[PDB]
Design a protein around this ligand. Structure first.
Ligand code: NA
Ligand code: NA
Length: 99
């Protein structure tokens, strides 16, 4: 998938055991309710890990407060959700972006 968002949604699908289109459609529908893309990604990640959305959102925000970058944090959260390494998820991200 071309864009960074599309690649994140693909990674979330893999972590969720759902299709890329299913995740995309959930993402689009939530945006239509007036949510922001970052907020929606965090909810999707929470769903994928079986964790509450508030817990995932607070972790994100705390990491940002430490001076981490948003995409980096999202990747780390996706890695937590799939039980894979941060390094493995980041590799996939850059690979998929690359094509
Ligand atoms: Na499925
Ligand atoms: Na983003």
């Amino acid at each position: 998938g071309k864009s960074p968002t599309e690649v994140l949604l693909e990674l979330i699908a893999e972590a969720s055991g759902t299709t890329r289109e299913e995740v995309k459609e959930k993402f689009l529908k939530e945006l239509r309710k007036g949510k922001s893309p970052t907020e929606v990604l965090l909810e999707l990640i929470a769903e994928a890990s079986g964790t509450t959305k508030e817990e995932v959102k607070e972790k994100f925000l705390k990491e940002l407060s430490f001076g981490k970058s948003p995409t980096e944090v999202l990747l780390e959260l996706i890695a937590e959700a799939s039980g894979t390494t941060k390094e493995e998820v980041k590799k996939k991200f850059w690979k998929e972006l690359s094509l």
